[PDB]
């Protein structure tokens, strides 16, 4: 489990490697510091699926989408 974008990055297991559209698709899902309960989606590089998480409403990172489809578009090829 290593992925690359333009320059490359490694982590700890084995399934044929992903050239990620954008680097942020491999960032951990981040709730941020605010306390709301917002259902959002992010790309999980280990299951290779877009998955649900709870966003607090502020800050965080780019691996965060309002829909399954919006997430596919950014973090999945064609």
């Amino acid at each position: 489990s290593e992925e690359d974008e333009e320059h490359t990055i490694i982590t700890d297991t084995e399934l044929p490697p992903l050239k990620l559209m954008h680097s942020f698709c491999a960032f951990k899902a981040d709730d941020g510091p605010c306390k709301a309960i917002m259902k959002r989606f992010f790309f999980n590089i280990f299951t290779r699926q877009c998955e649900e998480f709870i966003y607090g409403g502020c800050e965080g990172n780019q691996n965060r989408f309002e829909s399954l489809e919006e997430c596919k578009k950014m973090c999945t090829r064609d």
């Binding site: 491999a26 960032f27 899902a29 981040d30 590089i45």
Partner: peptide
């Protein structure tokens, strides 16, 4: 970056806890 079985930031589940 995500690491094997750690796809969320530190304290995600503990903070989530408290919200729900």
């Amino acid at each position: 970056f995500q690491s094997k079985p750690n796809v969320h930031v530190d304290g995600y589940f503990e903070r989530l806890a408290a919200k729900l």
